Structures are given as structure tokens and as C-alpha cells.
Ligand binder design. Structure first.
Ligand SMILES: Cc1nc2[nH]c(=S)[nH]c(=O)c2nc1C
Length: 267
DNA sequence: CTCTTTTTTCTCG
DNA sequence: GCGAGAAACAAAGA
């Protein structure tokens, strides 16, 4: 998932598990709890969930006054709310059991992570990762964005994926953003002119906010999304851009599959 | 059978 | 510092 899918999960969880007391925590794959499963089980058992926040693609469970559980779903992580007698599925790894149901984390590829962090360490945790601003008009300052692009010789798509210019773009939405901003994914950022940077800035915000409103792209929480029907380029290799007959091409850029419309996205 | 395909961090040169 | 490649892992397809 990318930011819109994580935000969709965050909103469904906020409606349903806030106020719930954790009765028990169980793991078939404790190694995904990077801070230590036994410690997490000891600290969080019997605590009440006070809220769910998000930073970039990270979910932040607020559990008691003094702990946050930072969860990253990486490539394929999925949460679901199930009855207490729900059967185990093959890639279920962790469960948080409440009195009237349970929250189960599954992840085929086992990439996702849980980290127990004290409340006053949450902001330092994200500072250390150098996560950039949230993709909103209030937080995403174009002036700083422009200065960072001017000072770099990186290609725009890898640089956007690093999460440092702005948080939350992954492979789907960076391809959508560059198509909307008419920018070649291998364009060196110090070559972007001011008017292109402005369109890129606005397009980042508009694509991600539209995706959030449509519930992201897609049985678990967050599989209700409609954004996949509005994708213009991602995963549409060989299909038309609607640009008078031009077809979408797929290349590899810094190891990632990359979908773009060459007519509209020249360097 | 092999090889490729689908977020973050690490190693190498 | 940089880019390239790969590692963590599972499954599906060519
Ligand atoms: C924190 C971080 N996240 C990333 N996420 C993606 S999708 N691609 C990246 O290259 C990347 N790089 C860094 C350093």
C-alpha cells in the first residue's frame, strides 16, 4: 500500500477499535516485531486504544498514554477485523484480541513491521528516517521543494520515492503524478523549471487527495477502493493515453517498473 | 526446470 | 556522498 491505502485503513480502524481494550496479543511470526514481541505483549496487554494516526505510509496506534505501535504494511500487509473464533489463514502473523473480536495482521511476503515506541519518541523516530512533509497544501511547501530539486542531480522518480521531498508516494502514484505533471521519470531534478515544479507540487497533492477520497486502489480493511479505476498509466502498458493514439510504455527506472506516456513526458 | 514480476534498508565499489 | 544491485519473502506467470 501507499499513503491513500494506509489512510483508508487508518480511517476504518479509527471507527472500530478506538476505545477497545487489548485482552491479549499473539504471534505466529514474532520476528516482524522489530522492538521485541515479548516486550510488546507485556506493555500493551490490558491497554486501551486511544486513537490511530498516520505519518507517510506508517500507521501509528496510540495505545495508552505512553506507547505508540508503529506499523508499516510494506508491499502486501493487510489488516482485518474478525470474530474471536475466526480460523487462522496461512499468512496471518499477529493478532490483537479484544473482548468482542480481533485485529489480525497478514502479510504474504513477511515484509511488514511493528515497532513499539514511547510517545515522546515518535517525533524523533520520523526525524531520524528523514520523512518529508505530508502531501497537503498546508504542509507541503513548494518553495523548499523547489530548492531541494535545484540542488540535486537525481532523477525525479527515484528522488520522489525516497520519501524525503514529500511523504507517501509509492510506485503507483508516482507514475500517476508524473503523467499528470507531464514529467519524464528520468528527468534530472536540477533541470526542472519553476513552472514544472509548481505543476508537480500541485499534482502530488491532488492525486493523493483524490485517491484518499476514493478509498485507495485495490476482503480486508481497505479493499473497498475505487481509485484503481482512475489510474491513467500504472499497469496499463500498451494501452492508449487518449493522447491521439499514443500507447503507454513500461521501462525500468532505478530498479522499478515505470509506466509513462512518452509523447506527454519528454525530458 | 529458470528467470522475472510485484517498500525499505543495506552493501559494494 | 553517489548509483546499482540486492536482501528481506512468497507466489504467480513466461
Ligand atoms: C525511506 C525510503 N523509502 C523508499 N521507498 C520507496 S517505494 N523507494 C525508495 O527508493 C525508498 N527509499 C528510501 C530511503
Amino acid at each position: 500500500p501507499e499513503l491513500p491505502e494506509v489512510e483508508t485503513v487508518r480511517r476504518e480502524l479509527e471507527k472500530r477499535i478506538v476505545g477497545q481494550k487489548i485482552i491479549s496479543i499473539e504471534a505466529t511470526y514474532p520476528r516482524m516485531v522489530l522492538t521485541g514481541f515479548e516486550q510488546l505483549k507485556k506493555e500493551l496487554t490490558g491497554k486501551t486504544i486511544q486513537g490511530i494516526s498516520r505519518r507517510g505510509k506508517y500507521l501509528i496506534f496510540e495505545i495508552g498514554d505512553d506507547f505508540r505501535l508503529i506499523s508499516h504494511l510494506r508491499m502486501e500487509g493487510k489488516y482485518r477485523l474478525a470474530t474471536l473464533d475466526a480460523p487462522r489463514e496461512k499468512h496471518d502473523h499477529l493478532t490483537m484480541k479484544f473482548a468482542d473480536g480481533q485485529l489480525i495482521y497478514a502479510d504474504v511476503r513477511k515484509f511488514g513491521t511493528w515497532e513499539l515506541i514511547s510517545t515522546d519518541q515518535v517525533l524523533p523516530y520520523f526525524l531520524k528516517k528523514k520523512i518529508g512533509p505530508e502531501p497537503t497544501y498546508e504542509d507541503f511547501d513548494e518553495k523548499l521543494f523547489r530548492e531541494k530539486l535545484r540542488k540535486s542531480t537525481k532523477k525525479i522518480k527515484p528522488y520522489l520515492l525516497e520519501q524525503t521531498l514529500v511523504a507517501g508516494l509509492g510506485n503507483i502514484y508516482v507514475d500517476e503524478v508524473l503523467w499528470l505533471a507531464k514529467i519524464h521519470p528520468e528527468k534530472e531534478t536540477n533541470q526542472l523549471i519553476e513552472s514544472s515544479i509548481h505543476l508537480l507540487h500541485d499534482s502530488i497533492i491532488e492525486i493523493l487527495q483524490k485517491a484518499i477520497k476514493l478509498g485507495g486502489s485495490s476482503s480486508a480493511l481497505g479493499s473497498t477502493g475505487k481509485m484503481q479505476n482512475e489510474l491513467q498509466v500504472y499497469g496499463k502498458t500498451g494501452e492508449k493515453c487518449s493522447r491521439c493514439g499514443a500507447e503507454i510504455q513500461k521501462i525500468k527506472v532505478a530498479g522499478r517498473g515505470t509506466h509513462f506516456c512518452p509523447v506527454c513526458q519528454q525530458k
